[PDB]
Paper text:
We prepared VLPs consisting of the CP units lacking 40 C-terminal residues, i.e whole C-IDR (CPΔC40), and analyzed them by cryo-EM. Interestingly, we detected only two different architectures of filaments. 65% of them had the stacked-ring architecture (VLPΔC40:r) and 35% had left-handed helical symmetry and encapsidated RNA (VLPΔC40:h+RNA). In contrast to the VLPΔC40 formed in bacteria, the filaments produced in vitro were architecturally nearly homogenous, with 97% of the RNA-free stacked-ring architecture (ivVLPΔC40:r).
CP consists of a highly conserved globular core flanked by two large extended regions with a high frequency of structural disorder. The C-terminal high intrinsic disorder region (C-IDR) is partially conserved and packaged in the lumen of the virion, supported by the helical ssRNA scaffold. Here, we show that we can control the shape, size, RNA encapsidation ability, symmetry, stability and surface functionalization of nanoparticles through structure-based design of CP from potato virus Y (PVY).
Numbering used by the authors:
A (entry chain Ab): 41 to 221
B (entry chain Ac): 77 to 221
C (entry chain Ar): 41 to 76
Write the structure that this text describes.
Amino acid sequence: THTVPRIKAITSKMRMPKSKGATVLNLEHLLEYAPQQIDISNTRATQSQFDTWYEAVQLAYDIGETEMPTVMNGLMVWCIENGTSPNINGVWVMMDGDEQVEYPLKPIVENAKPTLRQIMAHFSDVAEAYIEMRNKKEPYMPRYGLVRNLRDGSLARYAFDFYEVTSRTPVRAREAHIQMK
Amino acid sequence: QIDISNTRATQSQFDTWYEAVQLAYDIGETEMPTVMNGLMVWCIENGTSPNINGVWVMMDGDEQVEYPLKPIVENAKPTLRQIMAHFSDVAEAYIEMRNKKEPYMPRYGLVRNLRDGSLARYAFDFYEVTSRTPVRAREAHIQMK
Amino acid sequence: THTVPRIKAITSKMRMPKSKGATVLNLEHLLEYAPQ
């Protein structure tokens, strides 16, 4: 009785689900299957829906693979400032120089399954990588902020309707979206 | 406590909900497990009450693969939540493994403003509050649910 | 068993109408005939 007694740690065999004696899962793989948080979320559309929403818009405008990118570059900047739920009728605008050029919104909002927000979320990372660049020159704030009274200056990078709150969001901002959304 | 609760479906209902889905996909006993592995991870992040129409996704590499939701939600008696609860214990045993590498949080938390870091293990719609729940978390579900 | 299983898309052979073994239409043209 010279050895102090150490409490034994009972082992709670987790209840692995089964159907008829065999196991349902194959943990052998479960411990290796590791996706990314965004790519299985619903805040983004599957790469199928996005592939459709890109081919269909590439068709309605009838521009061409070589130049359609430059158009999408505009759609982001437009969405950032205004939002991602406009009237199906109407025109979004992009500019060369100062000659505003309009495009019809119908082919975009219509072919966006289930909604434009999701589809535009595919540019979320690039969106913040664009606002950061913009603010460097001068103080810029997504309008989404100007209507919600945001003047952090640091939260401007994450102020637009189609930011996907992933897991790597500085929490100084995650609060903003839920409060507004 | 779990095996007589209603938050889990009887082993009959679950046995049906597994055979029926094994049929609709027509995959095979050998590989259906790997699919169910995806359904959990999908349910964890999104929930367990999606539109009967639509597709849940699982990935090999980065080529998202879609499956139809209809055969799952339909054959789940009385609801998907219950059926998915059979993976509750494995679910937490999966989140714990995930957080080790980096900070991960079920989306169920991100929408409910959860940033405990320790409660992430128990943040998903289909956790069965058994009797062995650390009470630091039992409060979360009732407040949200 | 390292490859995720992809569901096969069964192919619903539309029932092209026929009379006595031969086909009634001539899709060869149907896919080009386009009126207003």
